[PDB]
Amino acid sequence: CLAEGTRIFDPVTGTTHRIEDVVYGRKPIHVVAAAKDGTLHARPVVSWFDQGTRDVIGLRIAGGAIVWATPDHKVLTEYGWRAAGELRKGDRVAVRDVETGELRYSVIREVLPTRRARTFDLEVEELHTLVAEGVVVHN
Amino acid sequence: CLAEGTRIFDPVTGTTHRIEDVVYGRKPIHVVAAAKDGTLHARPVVSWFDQGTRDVIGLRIAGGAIVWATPDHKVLTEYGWRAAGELRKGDRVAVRDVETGELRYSVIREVLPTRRARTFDLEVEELHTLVAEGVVVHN
Ligand SMILES: [Zn+2]
Ligand SMILES: [Zn+2]
């Protein structure tokens, strides 16, 4: 689950949305998703979910981004799918290079304390993952 | 997230496992996964997760099965991905016909009250879903 305020870049329209708005209006946007062979493609959001308030932690990535998600959220790392919760400073997560648009790895700056906040999800045709706050994560 | 005691049928070895054991021993098993075109294929478990205790609800399906999962778990239904929590008696979920091995829909008999219990997850190569307790669900 992802907290409200999570930025989801629409690779097709270049537009950046706040996840909750995508959900609230069941908006048919696209997101950047990475194939198992580690890549990145444009994919439509076929499902929307208002998961409700839960506890989210926050991983501040090198570059500036900060992901707020439920400790169980799978994040792509220098290992492959892992749980946000079981991640620490120094660990590298998969991200979308804003320039090239390629998958690379950024170090976590610091892991922020848990908090309450609305949460959401989005399923994505095929690939099954999305790029949120510049970080590749499990859809 | 899925509660301990969840049965995962290994389509390749015909063997039925209890999810937690798969996790505890990082067992490289296979599960039945359905392609977006609604089907069912054999797929290897590439990841394992010990999600920890959470609250799980239980959907008792026609035929006998009973799925215990976190209210946010996506289940394939006569609608497509939905959250276990927001499901009621009469709703139909996608399942694996034990005989033919085809995807079909079974009615929910009753939705059981929430409870505490260890939870787990398994990622599955490609398809991204598994058949648990005879019910198709989101991996
Ligand atoms: Zn998915
Ligand atoms: Zn997956």
UniProtKB/Swiss-Prot annotation, chains A, B:
Name under which the protein is recorded: Endonuclease PI-MtuI
Organism name: Mycobacterium tuberculosis (strain CDC 1551 / Oshkosh)
Residues of the full protein shown: 252 to 691 of 790
